């Protein structure tokens, strides 16, 4: 249902400048143009986004309308040709089931720190993903 949704705000550090969103996939649900759940967009459109430092953009997904199912999927973040990592989520419809999400970095050269999100209830809601380039201290 539309009650199951996530919207990921992609924040790119000047340590990277531009992040390519690629390889988006869904096991359940659809992508949409935040904030209008009726405005469905293709996986290819999501997988063509370039996010610039200073101007965050949103990747949003919800369950299919009136269905007893939610949204589950992922997308990859790239710094040019170099994979930074993968953001994944699982927002089930079933009442009482835990909602989950994570960024998994490809290496210690990049980090994706998340803030926000509901582990319980219908929707994950808005989550911020802050991406940067890092070196060991």
Author numbering: 2 to 138
Which sentences from the paper describe this structure?
Members of the aegerolysin protein family are acidic proteins of 13–20 kDa, which are mainly found in bacteria and fungi. The crystal structures of RahU revealed the conserved aegerolysin fold as well as a ligand binding cavity, harbouring a Tris molecule from the crystallization solution.
Recombinant RahU protein was expressed using E. coli expression system, purified and subjected to crystallization trials. The crystal structure of the apo-RahU was determined at 1.27 Å resolution. The structure shows that RahU is a single domain protein with a distinct β-sandwich architecture that is typical for bacterial and fungal aegerolysins. Some of these residues, such as Val20, Ile22, Ile60, Thr72, Phe76, Phe88, Trp90, Asn100 and Trp102, are positioned in the mainly hydrophobic core to maintain the integrity of β-sandwich architecture. However, a majority of the conserved non-alanine and non-glycine residues, including Trp6, Ser16, Asn24, Trp29, Lys31, Lys38, Asp39, Glu41, Ser43, Arg65, Asp77, Asp80, Asp91, Pro93, Trp94, Thr99, Thr101, Ser116, Asn119 and Thr129, is solvent-exposed and/or positioned in the loop areas, possibly providing a uniform environment to aid in the membrane lipid recognition step.
